[PDB]
Amino acid sequence: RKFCRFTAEGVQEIDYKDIATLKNYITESGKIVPSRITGTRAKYQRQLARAIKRARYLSLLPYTDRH
Amino acid sequence: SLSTEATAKIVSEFGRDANDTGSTEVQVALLTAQINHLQGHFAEHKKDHHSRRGLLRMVSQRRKLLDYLKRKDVARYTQLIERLGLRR
Amino acid sequence: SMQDPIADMLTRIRNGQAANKAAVTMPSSKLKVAIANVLKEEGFIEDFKVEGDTKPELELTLKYFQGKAVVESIQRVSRPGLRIYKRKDELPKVMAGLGIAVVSTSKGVMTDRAARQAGLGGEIICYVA
Amino acid sequence: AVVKCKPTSPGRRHVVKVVNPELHKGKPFAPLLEKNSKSGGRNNNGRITTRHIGGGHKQAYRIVDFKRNKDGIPAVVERLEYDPNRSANIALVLYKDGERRYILAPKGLKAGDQIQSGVDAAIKPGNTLPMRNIPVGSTVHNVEMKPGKGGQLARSAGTYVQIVARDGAYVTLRLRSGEMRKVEADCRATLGEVGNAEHMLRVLGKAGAARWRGVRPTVRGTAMNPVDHPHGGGEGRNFGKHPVTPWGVQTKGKKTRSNKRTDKFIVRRRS
Amino acid sequence: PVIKVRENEPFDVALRRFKRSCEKAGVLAEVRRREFYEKPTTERKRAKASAVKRHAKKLARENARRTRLY
Amino acid sequence: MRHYEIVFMVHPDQSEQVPGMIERYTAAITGAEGKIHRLEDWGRRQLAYPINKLHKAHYVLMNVEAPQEVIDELETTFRFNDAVIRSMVMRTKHAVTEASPMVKAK
RNA sequence: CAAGCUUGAGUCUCGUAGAGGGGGGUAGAAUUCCAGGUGUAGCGGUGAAAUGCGUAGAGAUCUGGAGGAAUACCGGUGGCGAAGGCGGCCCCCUGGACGAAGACUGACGCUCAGGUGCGAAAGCGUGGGGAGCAAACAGGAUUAGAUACCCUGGUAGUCCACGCCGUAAACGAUGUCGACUUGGAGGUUGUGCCCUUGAGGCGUGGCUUCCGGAGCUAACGCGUUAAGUCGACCGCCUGGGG
Ligand SMILES: [Mg+2]
Ligand SMILES: [Mg+2]
Ligand SMILES: [Mg+2]
Ligand SMILES: [Mg+2]
Ligand SMILES: [Mg+2]
Ligand SMILES: [Mg+2]
Ligand SMILES: [Mg+2]
Ligand SMILES: [Mg+2]
Ligand SMILES: [Mg+2]
Ligand SMILES: [Mg+2]
Ligand SMILES: [Mg+2]
Ligand SMILES: [Mg+2]
Ligand SMILES: [Mg+2]
Ligand SMILES: [Mg+2]
Ligand SMILES: [Mg+2]
Ligand SMILES: [Mg+2]
Ligand SMILES: [Mg+2]
Ligand SMILES: [Mg+2]
Ligand SMILES: [Mg+2]
Ligand SMILES: [Mg+2]
Ligand SMILES: [Mg+2]
Numbered sequence: 001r002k003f004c005r006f007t008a009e010g011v012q013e014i015d016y017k018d019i020a021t022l023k024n025y026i027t028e029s030g031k032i033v034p035s036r037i038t039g040t041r042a043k044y045q046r047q048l049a050r051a052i053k054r055a056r057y058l059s060l061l062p063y064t065d066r067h
Numbered sequence: 068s069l070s071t072e073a074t075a076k077i078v079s080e081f082g083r084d085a086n087d088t089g090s091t092e093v094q095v096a097l098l099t100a101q102i103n104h105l106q107g108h109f110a111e112h113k114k115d116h117h118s119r120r121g122l123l124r125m126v127s128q129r130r131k132l133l134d135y136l137k138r139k140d141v142a143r144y145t146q147l148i149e150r151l152g153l154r155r
Numbered sequence: 156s157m158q159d160p161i162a163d164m165l166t167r168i169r170n171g172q173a174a175n176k177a178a179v180t181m182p183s184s185k186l187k188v189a190i191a192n193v194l195k196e197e198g199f200i201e202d203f204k205v206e207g208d209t210k211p212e213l214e215l216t217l218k219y220f221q222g223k224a225v226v227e228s229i230q231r232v233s234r235p236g237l238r239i240y241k242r243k244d245e246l247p248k249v250m251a252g253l254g255i256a257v258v259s260t261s262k263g264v265m266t267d268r269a270a271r272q273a274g275l276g277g278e279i280i281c282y283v284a
Numbered sequence: 285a286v287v288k289c290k291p292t293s294p295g296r297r298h299v300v301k302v303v304n305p306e307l308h309k310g311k312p313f314a315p316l317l318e319k320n321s322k323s324g325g326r327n328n329n330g331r332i333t334t335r336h337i338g339g340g341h342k343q344a345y346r347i348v349d350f351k352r353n354k355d356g357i358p359a360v361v362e363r364l365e366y367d368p369n370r371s372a373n374i375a376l377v378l379y380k381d382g383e384r385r386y387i388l389a390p391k392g393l394k395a396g397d398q399i400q401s402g403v404d405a406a407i408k409p410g411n412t413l414p415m416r417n418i419p420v421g422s423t424v425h426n427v428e429m430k431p432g433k434g435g436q437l438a439r440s441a442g443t444y445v446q447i448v449a450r451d452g453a454y455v456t457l458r459l460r461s462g463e464m465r466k467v468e469a470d471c472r473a474t475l476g477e478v479g480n481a482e483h484m485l486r487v488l489g490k491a492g493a494a495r496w497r498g499v500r501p502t503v504r505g506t507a508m509n510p511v512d513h514p515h516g517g518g519e520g521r522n523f524g525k526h527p528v529t530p531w532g533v534q535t536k537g538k539k540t541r542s543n544k545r546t547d548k549f550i551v552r553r554r555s
Numbered sequence: 556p557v558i559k560v561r562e563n564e565p566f567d568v569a570l571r572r573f574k575r576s577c578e579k580a581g582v583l584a585e586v587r588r589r590e591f592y593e594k595p596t597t598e599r600k601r602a603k604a605s606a607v608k609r610h611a612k613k614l615a616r617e618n619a620r621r622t623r624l625y
Numbered sequence: 626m627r628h629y630e631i632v633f634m635v636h637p638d639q640s641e642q643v644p645g646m647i648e649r650y651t652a653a654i655t656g657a658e659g660k661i662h663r664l665e666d667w668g669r670r671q672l673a674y675p676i677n678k679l680h681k682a683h684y685v686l687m688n689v690e691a692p693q694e695v696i697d698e699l700e701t702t703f704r705f706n707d708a709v710i711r712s713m714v715m716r717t718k719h720a721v722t723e724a725s726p727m728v729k730a731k
Numbered sequence: 732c733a734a735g736c737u738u739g740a741g742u743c744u745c746g747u748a749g750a751g752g753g754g755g756g757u758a759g760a761a762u763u764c765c766a767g768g769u770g771u772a773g774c775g776g777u778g779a780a781a782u783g784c785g786u787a788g789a790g791a792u793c794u795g796g797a798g799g800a801a802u803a804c805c806g807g808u809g810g811c812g813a814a815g816g817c818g819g820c821c822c823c824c825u826g827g828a829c830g831a832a833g834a835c836u837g838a839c840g841c842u843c844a845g846g847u848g849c850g851a852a853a854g855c856g857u858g859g860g861g862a863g864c865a866a867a868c869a870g871g872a873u874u875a876g877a878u879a880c881c882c883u884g885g886u887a888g889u890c891c892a893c894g895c896c897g898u899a900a901a902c903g904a905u906g907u908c909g910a911c912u913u914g915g916a917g918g919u920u921g922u923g924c925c926c927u928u929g930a931g932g933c934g935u936g937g938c939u940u941c942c943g944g945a946g947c948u949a950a951c952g953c954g955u956u957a958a959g960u961c962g963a964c965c966g967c968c969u970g971g972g973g
Contacts (some may be wrong), residue, residue, distance in 0.1 A: 088743035089835030121826035
């Protein structure tokens with residue numbers, strides 16, 4: 001049923017600067033979605049985790065829902 | 068690690084042609100260069116046992132290759148040892 | 156490592172017989188071809204053919220009779236860790252003369268029955284039954 | 285380093301030596317030397333006022349620069365010299381105007397290092413500048429209590445203080461004793477910990493190693509007579525009273541500080 | 556977890572959204588997990604038991620699908 | 626010499642001298658034949674969480690083809706500086722001269 | 732013994748994934764403590780209680796600050812490592828593995844008694860550090876008794892540096908190496924192709940879970956990652972206690 005998004009377009013790494021296709025993989029509480037529900041490949045979910053961690057380090061994205 | 072120019076250089080003066088990367092003498096020279104390089108790493112990273120395992124693999128590999136050259140012929144073996152700086 | 160290529164040959168026949176394979180393939184050697192020749196003269200295998208030049212390979216065509224393997228039991232006697240040599244008067248008789256024992260003597264690789272009448276004796280490579 | 289001696293003789297069995305190969309071998313700088321005769325612990329009345337001091341090796345005083353008021357002049361470290369008059373080693377720095385001075389050697393200091401002084405000095409070990417310019421949370425030493433008075437705090441071998449806060453014309457300091465104290469921001473201080481931190485790892489090893497240092501034997505009051513010490517003496521080993529100084533003020537707990545003039549600076553006491 | 560009251564939102568649906576957001580964030584579950592210390596052996600063992608049970612139920616689903624009853 | 630990219634966050638109330646800050650750093654790298662392969666002054670940006678009791682910041686991203694040693698002093702100038710509230714240095718596999726998605730949207 | 736051969740074993744070339752290792756920084760959430768504001772009669776705890784904390788103003792709540800430890804989500808019978816083990820992000824140094832197409836050396840290999848090196852936790856030495864947790868110990872319950880299970884506290888230790896120790900249900904309770912023997916579904920990482928149309932299939936490797944065939948096994952079960960069929964070498968066992 002579900003298919004990975006980043007497989008459709010050739011991506012060489014997940015870019016931390018992006019906020020598009022990063023805000024959507026973060027949930028309302030700031031947590032980051034598992035590959036189980038978001039239907040993404042394990043090749044990019046490690047990169048997605050790393051990208052989200054970099055972004056929340058630089059305050060582009062929040063750690064939590066509050067702050 | 069050992070870089071492209073470093074490997075391709077020592078093979079140039081230990082191998083007859085630039086395509087003799089598998090000769091026994093060039094292998095010992097490659098191993099010796101990498102071993103002497105890692106001496107600088109482990110002089111201040113004593114607690115790197117995982118990496119020192121790889122260093123001992125190269126050291127052990129070099130001894131076996133040197134043993135093979137001595138059994139084949141002592142002439143080129145002795146010449147190699149003098150020019151490379153090893154003892155025995 | 157690989158230290159008994161003759162044991163490898165015998166194991167391939169045994170496993171091919173058990174799995175009902177029409178043929179087995181394996182890297183060739185002079186002693187291997189001699190043992191295959193002994194089996195072929197004796198009637199245990201269909202036919203062997205050697206192909207290739209730099210890397211020879213024995214392609215053995217196994218033999219069957221009704222629904223059973225022709226070779227009941229094939230095993231190696233002389234081994235790298237234990238060499239076995241027998242004289243003329245002590246050659247073994249596998250299964251009371253209804254099986255063969257491959258014997259490497261001075262004249263060539265051959266069966267115990269033929270070696271006992273040639274009067275040679277030698278090393279006992281294999282038991283085939 | 286920390287060198288343990290071999291037990292070739294008793295009195296050498298337990299000796300642990302602190303050996304510093306970077307220490308200068310030879311004579312000190314002549315202009316900066318001055319005599320300091322010993323006292324034996326006696327004041328100008330000739331009476332012993334502090335006990336257990338006497339003898340030891342003769343020493344010469346080194347004029348150490350605690351003020352560090354040669355501002356705007358970079359200096360190069362020439363030698364790290366041993367100083368008999370303190371637990372820390374000293375450094376002979378040569379300013380680029382021809383002046384040599386003694387400073388307390390910090391942890392990271394070696395020959396050829398550049399030190400600096402003033403409000404524009406860089407944040408680097410051995411650089412001395414006021415705490416109004418030193419960042420908060422940094423490790424400093426040779427702290428002066430009053431502006432221009434010269435360094436008085438964190439002067440032993442491996443000591444330092446932490447600048448934990450600043451509010452207006454004061455900064456808060458965590459001292460090596462572990463208390464918080466306020467000192468004016470105009471007071472100068474030197475960056476980094478003072479060196480020779482191995483000083484505490486040595487052991488004298490002999491009763492005479494302390495005598496070399498000018499320390500005379502301590503006699504227990506319980507070993508005395510009733511006329512000499514309050515702990516007095518009985519038949520056999522008797523001690524039936526609370527421990528006291530030789531003058532009747534009791535040790536093992538009695539706080540003796542009484543200074544209401546300087547209480548306003550102590551944010552917290554040690555513990 | 557943070558919810559704002561929209562226009563035309565009674566207390567009923569407001570509390571429902573609060574509760575639903577509570578499971579979605581899972582906050583109640585993680586508080587119960589950290590209520591007590593659990594050993595690395597214990598999390599490894601519980602997860603292994605969980606994995607085998609999910610997998611066991613997984614193929615039991617297909618076996619029940621491929622079998623025929625009555 | 627390998628491929629790095631540095632993004633540094635400066636205090637918002639001292640954004641005026643921020644353009645001058647890029648020239649000083651770029652001059653220090655270029656003096657050592659370093660290259661500035663991408664520059665993007667993102668300017669005013671609101672933070673996801675309050676750092677240092679403030680919710681606003683001035684973002685500057687930049688990409689350099691530089692020697693190993695020349696970035697160590699850059700990081701220590703950030704550490705002892707007070708303008709930059711945060712700094713970040715990352716290795717990059719190749720050069721990236723292409724602009725970032727958010728700046729092209731803005 | 733002599734010469735040779737490339738199939739075993741290696742070297743070079745371009746890449747890919749990885750909590751592999753050592754060093755140095757840094758970020759956020761939370762716990763505890765200190766200083767203050769608001770505020771009042773409880774808090775905390777349990778099967779039920781009590782010890783304890785609190786009217787000398789606790790707990791709760793808000794704002795500052797100190798400090799130490801571990802890295803939620805990602806996260807997965809996922810990955811890496813000879814094993815022990817390795818989980819925030821970044822930088823520096825560094826080991827191994829696998830894949831593609833060649834080039835090169837030419838048996839240089841396997842195994843290994845003694846020997847050497849690595850080796851969880853606890854423990855030991857010296858010097859630091861110490862928030863949380865917590866042997867010992869103390870008090871309160873429970874109980875016929877309770878040197879325990881429960882509760883309130885609490886030192887060593889857990890953390891760091893450098894040594895020592897060399898032990899674990901150190902387990903896959905399964906030595907290492909090599910070859911052969913029907914299948915099926917996954918995971919993970921490469922790689923060649925096909926109207927590459929595409930958010931489509933056909934091959935080929937490495938590693939890895941599950942089920943199961945022959946066979947083997949006392950049985951349970953193992954089952955191409957064997958406990959099947961075989962070879963090389965090493966370790967070990969010989970009734971239960973003592
Ligand atoms: Mg005294
Ligand atoms: Mg004494
Ligand atoms: Mg005495
Ligand atoms: Mg007396
Ligand atoms: Mg008397
Ligand atoms: Mg008296
Ligand atoms: Mg007495
Ligand atoms: Mg007496
Ligand atoms: Mg007496
Ligand atoms: Mg008496
Ligand atoms: Mg008495
Ligand atoms: Mg008295
Ligand atoms: Mg409270
Ligand atoms: Mg431990
Ligand atoms: Mg200890
Ligand atoms: Mg308890
Ligand atoms: Mg284990
Ligand atoms: Mg054991
Ligand atoms: Mg065992
Ligand atoms: Mg081995
Ligand atoms: Mg099975």
